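cache lookup: miss for this entity combination. No prior model stored, computing from scratch. Input as submitted by user K.M.:
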Amino acid sequence: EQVEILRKFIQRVQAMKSPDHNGEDNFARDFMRLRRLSTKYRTEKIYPTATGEKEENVKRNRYKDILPFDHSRVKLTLKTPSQDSDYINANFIKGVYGPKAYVATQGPLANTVIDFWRMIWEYNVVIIVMACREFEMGRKKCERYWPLYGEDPITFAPFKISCEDEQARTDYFIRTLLLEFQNESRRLYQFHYVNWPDSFDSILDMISLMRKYQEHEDVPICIHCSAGCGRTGAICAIDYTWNLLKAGKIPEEFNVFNLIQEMRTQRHSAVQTKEQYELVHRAIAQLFEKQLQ
Amino acid sequence: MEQVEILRKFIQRVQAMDNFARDFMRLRRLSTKYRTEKIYPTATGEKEENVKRNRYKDILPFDHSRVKLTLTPSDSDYINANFIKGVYGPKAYVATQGPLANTVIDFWRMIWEYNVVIIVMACREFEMGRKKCERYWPLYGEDPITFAPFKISCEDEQARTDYFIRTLLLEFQNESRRLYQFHYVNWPDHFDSILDMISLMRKYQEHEDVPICIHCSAGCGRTGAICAIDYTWNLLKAGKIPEEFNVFNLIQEMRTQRHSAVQTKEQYELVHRAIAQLFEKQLQ
Amino acid sequence: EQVEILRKFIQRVQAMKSPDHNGEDNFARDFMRLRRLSTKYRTEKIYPTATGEKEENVKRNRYKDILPFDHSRVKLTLKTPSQDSDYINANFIKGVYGPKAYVATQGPLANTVIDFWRMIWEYNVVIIVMACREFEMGRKKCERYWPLYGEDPITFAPFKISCEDEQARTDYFIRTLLLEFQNESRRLYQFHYVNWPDHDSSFDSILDMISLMRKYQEHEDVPICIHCSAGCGRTGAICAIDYTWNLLKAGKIPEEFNVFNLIQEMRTQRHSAVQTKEQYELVHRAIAQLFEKQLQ
Amino acid sequence: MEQVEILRKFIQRVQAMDNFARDFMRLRRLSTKYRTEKIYPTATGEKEENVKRNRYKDILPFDHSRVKLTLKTPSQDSDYINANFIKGVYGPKAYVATQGPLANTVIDFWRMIWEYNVVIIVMACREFEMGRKKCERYWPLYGEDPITFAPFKISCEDEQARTDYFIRTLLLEFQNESRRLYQFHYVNWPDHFDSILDMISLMRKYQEHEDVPICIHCSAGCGRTGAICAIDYTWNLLKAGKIPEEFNVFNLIQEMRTQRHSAVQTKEQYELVHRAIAQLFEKQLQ
């Protein structure tokens, strides 16, 4: 029964914290293996990234080491006067109920904000989760593609984006946006998490509140950080498990390593560091604990 | 069952087909029977204040498919204009009348709010000692004509066979926009150049993701014929010509989106022939 | 004895919290008087604002009701190719040791960022305290005059400003800036408080910001620049507290210590220094907190 | 006490004074003494590296007052230009006195205009004089396409003809920032006033203050340059009502000659400064 499964996971995670005889805990080691698995898949050419590495698309990638898998990449069939390439650096990730629950994508560049919106429009996305800041550690991480609350609307023809409300919670904002295109308009919600801890209350909070805005998985939710993996992947993994949980459906053979490993076959480096890998485990452990009265 | 077969039959029947006049009368008859049970009303267009925005008292835009404007310092949602669906986009074309002096403003309200980039005009400002269309562009070299809040200026021209191509710009609140007006100044009222124009126009915009604005004087007739041909050509290129493909049904369907889409048996006949040309031109 | 004086203020502040027969506590009532006094001074023409209201300076004022007193207004004698007017919406406020401990100023407009920099330079300012966000309540409050950390340097000829470091603390940031002019260079420290709280002890982050800022500048030999949107309210709130904390640190809280008087006096130097009764209460509670901290 | 009186003595003494040549000799002798006796060194200027950045191997910029360039280019890296700051009535950098640039230094020159936010350039010589090249033309002529000097660029934008001088409006770009400028080109130095006095007072309509330097230069960056500074500086003291009781040209020039080498260069320029300043004074006394 769920209770036995939940307690087992919690005790498991508790044990994973203990260092090796070589000073490496389970998070460290599980993570190495994840990294080895990715090399394996690459070198067997199981998950090629051919489109992303074409000479045309180099200018459309934020980091030359982060490329979208061909098999799961988001294709832009909606065209504009200025941009008609189907290429964006983003991939679909499967959710608890099936394909396309998430779209994980890089933080847009100046020349790809337009593609960002083409994607948001074509795929009927309502929810945007941003988990980086525009600037971090002295470096630019993401183009600001949303107007500040009180700013005049911003034009990325043929798109028009306006911010009609903002709301502050502990470590994040919720911006209500209006996206307009050719006489149509769509209200979006952007959840901007601005405080990352490379305990997890603000993230769990954000995720549940976000799921009150979009309860279902009928249109993908869009999640990006700077590269579109790392934090992005940590967020998907927790959201996913939380849905499982709430659906009262934590499967007996629940294995987070397997969830992340699979996620990593749909978005390159989905969860990117061992620190993130531990985060996901502890946050779920906390979820499980709460539900355990 | 297969593209190449389907095509050759068509060129077959359209080599026989005056049964054109007769098929057309059948269309006009079906049309009228559509303006009786009133399956497609034009309420908005025949309201008091809108009489002034209509070039012809008998050409009113179908309510269901009409283009609404919302973009001024003065503010109606009405313009005599309808969307026509393309192979995939429900707003592939906008078919509208030639603007009147007092509507040219709504015209740009429309060109702007809908992100349009291609304008196809198929009439002359004056035809047969009659005004047909308010010249809404600056002549190549003339100063930027204004239409507050819209500013619009020519920027180039080019003389293809029976038509011209004008690179225009259009400002409004320190935003800009380059447009291309294709102006066919020579219609056969009573092909190559039409076929040539559409293909060149489709080098400027292959897709249907923003509307292409088309218009003659009444905004149907020369307009309808062109939409029909371009639509079929796109269907042709995608290799999607359906088995029982048929101009009659094509035009009828179009006529439920834009009042009297194709206006004369002469246009109707021209549609058959340009398409047949395309089809045969495709079997090398 | 300091202990007696400190305890008396705390107890006084506690008593000010209780509403009277008409529902108004001492904060509300003191504050009414401050407003009455300001209008008294206006109408007796004791503190004219003639310069700020000349036709030519209307475009240089964020809010039409907030004008700099002539007598204490900051004059820009440093001229630039683009701007040679001496006018900026800003005043000096006296500190514990004499004139010019503070410069209170509005958040620069697009057309006055250049005046903001002329002022910062001419007056050898090092510390800047910003206590509003660029937008609030869906309105624009302040022109962004600082480059973001990692952003390319920004130019307002003839000044150039760079951000070389940013530091996050609870409810504020500390940006290390470099201001350059004509081949010269000065390091600035901007303290940007982004989380104003009307009220609530409580106020911990405000006190933190202040004491930390005071480690970057112990002395009062050049003015500290403080601004919010209007350059009063939060600005005045922060001066009063910083002012008292210095007094306190110097172990110098006078017997006749009267915050009403401190603020009243400030209001004759910067129009509406402390602008609402909520801020008025805030100043009292924050100091009360300081006082008990010191009492252990 | 009393400007008007102080102003009087002067016009007096000047109409009384030849004694200019004698006074100037005393200046040159005092100067010589001030390099011996190396009271103001120009080590930087004398180094082998910069020998090619100097128009004259005789005119070196005092180290203490020389204008250092630190706007690194792509890439001239030296912080050397043959130029000195001269104090104004209140600003330590009211003026820059430099030599007319050489072909290889026209770049440093614009590095200087740019890093110091200059706006007014005063040129007091011609490209060619007396059969000799005096100064590299660093500006585009009215009409000509924008000239360029990576990583700079500079065009023209108008020209005007006052009496003995021109007024050239220019733009100058550098990483698409941009700046308007005003070069006053005096093409008729008699060496050997109205027109000089006229030019200075026009220039001071364009920029009254001393908060960005005015760049002045002839060929060597002293002589016509120094005289113009002396006059402008005195005029500003005149207008401010600050003419000191003991005011005199000898001490004015001496002091100037501790900031830019051999500031006023010929006894004819020395005499010129005297007579222009007298003219200015008799004007102030209505």
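stored under new cache key. The longest strand of chain C covers residues 159-169.
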